[PDB]
Amino acid sequence: KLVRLPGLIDVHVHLREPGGTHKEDFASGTAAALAGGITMVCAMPNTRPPIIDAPALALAQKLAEAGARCDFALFLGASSENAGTLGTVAGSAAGLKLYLNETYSELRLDSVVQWMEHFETWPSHLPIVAHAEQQTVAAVLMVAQLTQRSVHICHVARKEEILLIKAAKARGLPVTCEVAPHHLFLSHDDLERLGPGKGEVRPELGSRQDVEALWENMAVIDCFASDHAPHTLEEKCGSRPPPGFPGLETMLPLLLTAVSEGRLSLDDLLQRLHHNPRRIFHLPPQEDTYVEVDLEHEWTIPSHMPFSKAHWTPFEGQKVKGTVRRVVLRGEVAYIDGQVLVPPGYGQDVRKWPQGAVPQLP
Template sequence: MTERNNAWLICNATLVNEGRRWVGDIRVRNGRIDAIGEALEQLPGEELINATGLWLLPGMIDDQVHFREPGLTHKADIASESRACAAGGITSFMEMPNTRPAALDRATLEAKYAIAAQSSVVNYAFYMGASNDNLEAIRQIDPASTPGLKVFMGASTGNMLVDNPEVLNEIFRVSPVPIITHCEDTPMINVELERAKARFGDDIPAREHPLIRSREACIKSTRLAIELARKHGTRLHVLHISTAQELALFEPGPIAGKRITAETCVHFLHFTDHDYDRLGFLIKCNPAIKSAHDRTAIVKALAEGRLDVLATDHAPHLLEEKQGHYNQAPSGIPLVQYALQAALERVFQGELSLERLVEVVSHAPAELFQVRGRGYLREGYAADLVLVDPQRPHRVTNDEVLSKCGWTPFNDTTFASSIVATFVNGERVWDGTAVDGAVRGHRLYFSHRR
């Protein structure tokens, strides 16, 4: 087997980090950033990468993915989806607990970590899930090795919808890690679904999805989560904000010191309800993609710090599963491979600064979850890096998709940039053409404070 190089000198790159942009060099040794400077001398054993004209960013930390393993590996698994992450510049992921079995206790959680240790080419962490009957397991969460507790306050599968008000209150009171919420009000959704069935029967068109999964259902549930967090002083992170109205519930400004934070996702920056007629159930997801007005407001809120984190909610399903009628087509979109490029389109359009984008995809998730030694270009930090060519357009096709599902909603889209290299713990896992499947990511660790 060919020995992989783990010592690099990346020179003449445009480094983007902590609100600054400058041309410089980075030396990588022993999996870490050894030095940052200008005109660094190439040392024996180092491979030189001339990155003139390229952007060098800290790798994206995606705090919301669904990789389907165990239990649903016909759709995706940790091996396939982590490779898609690498090709997209995502160097760490945090995966959701609604697998089969659901990760509702430490033993099930550790089994997922064991799978990732054998198969993931990027760094990994797994949330524990909340249910109506696992309070004792929640009390026993290890804050150093668990990023957060996922609470479905809207529709979910299996035993993961927490709809007992007393249990929900207690979860917010006792959780030793940040609570991560999916906020949609199930009774309101059910009312709208019955109305749509009465009108359309089984042939509910995709464009009805944002009316069924309504903005009012999102707002009501988000308000409840915030009320509970304020009551108990809980650290709360609200996932995938999709409406303009919810934005007023969150404070603008830096993430440091915030107890209540919010995230949006790349598809809410890219698509609107006008895309349902073109893409149909391919962009059916929960919460639903809504109007152009919502998209504009979300991008603005991301720019001003009212929204703190940008993630994917990557949720692959097979293409044939997406071809059924409304009630058959599952919700979820595969996104990790093109998330960073899609987000960079907002930079090229002048809606977000490049420095702010790096903040929301790398620095902010590292701060929110207190990820140890990652998320920044800093000496001594893990060398989780991505090189972007902002002058090389990339036309996306389904043929190049690495996710097991084999398709992307960005098929036939041309992005203005390309991901030319991704490094995980100092190893080049993506070279712009292929993934090095022999690389193994590391488990993430955290320094949570209540």
């Protein structure tokens, strides 16, 4: 009755430690990952302090090693000050993250020349991912071509963006992309229900036509990734609502529902949550690691999932078919039926494994 899946990989999570641990920490966020059938996460650098230099990375690595329940890699973040300074720690990170749209964090870049400087100085064999919306997708593709390297586009959300990426792939350009579940399963039609606070997310929810274009262009989507962006309900409903949705615990059930309806195949799902994350980010295999799912169980998403400290979900009320029953991580039962059974600190930094280093020429 159960289907065995390999250990799934989420290449875009915000786990809020250090500095935002009321929203999530490594222990709670990786519990959420495990309950979602995810055994490896790549954590974004917009923490407090942000992971924009070697001391911050070193702190974050130890916090993750002590708190993570599944395996992980940590992104470095590009800043207006750190191009040309990250070479000695670059290979220990998941990759470099560029935040190219609205932000007031230390991740704000003022000029496309600063993007160029990062593409020129970051080691050419290591991943670069960009938060790049609408025309910014075309702009960062131009910078990638000028510097003769690849780029990965985070959370593609619009018809405009997926068609631009499709055209770039047709010209043989080295671009990959990911899509998040809220841009496949929510739209403007859901904003009345969500309200303006909860509904705040970046990239924003798309139109019905945006959602339909992403499904129609599934072949263009290399990865699914949650952009798990936990904020508390108080924050989402307050005066200055921060953008983002929690998503680790709902991603796989939503996508399994779509598989059961014939909207994509099981293989399509596994390419996008396992094989392509591995190959784009050079993430290592996890020995004796698998996920068992029950594809027949129908349930309704509640007002909050059990594990994320966000304690809310924008998918409340959606009917799904598919549920994670058991997760085994490196030979240990990590999750069964609503209970996480590996402690904080069980998880490891996959970039320290010999198989987890990105290959490079001498």
